[PDB]
């Protein structure tokens, strides 16, 4: 409901890179004011446009349609989220994407996406302990910008302790 409160807690607990995912631009705008650094917009380009006009400098957009991804970029979206092959990261950069986030449940897949120029590696595995291990594996390999998502700030805090650089607060 009011998830921006989770951003405050993680801020005070030493989270330097916090993202906020929501389908309400006002909910997203309020999160930016509470310390959120990345606004993930889940017809949704009207949101990235508003947040862009409201001074947001790190808007992410996810979608399976590339005409949709392309429209989001034109409206201001700085980050584009690919959900798992890694062979489309370079293809996506040609569309004009300044930053590419790659979501996958396997660390090998994420490392492959990192070699192709992916800037952000989102760990999204079924189990929580299995997700922890993938963060740990990527951290050991030196992967920069490891991201983990959860609607429980305690899991996010644990993620940060395991090696996650970006904590995605999932608002709902």
Residue numbers in the entry: 4 to 45, 51 to 92, 98 to 185
The authors write:
Protein stability can be fine‐tuned by modifying different structural features such as hydrogen‐bond networks, salt bridges, hydrophobic cores, or disulfide bridges. Among these, stabilization by salt bridges is a major challenge in protein design and engineering since their stabilizing effects show a high dependence on the structural environment in the protein, and therefore are difficult to predict and model. In this work, we explore the effects on structure and stability of an introduced salt bridge cluster in the context of three different de novo TIM barrels.
Analysis of the formed geometries of the salt bridge cluster in the crystal structures show either highly ordered salt bridge clusters or only single salt bridges.
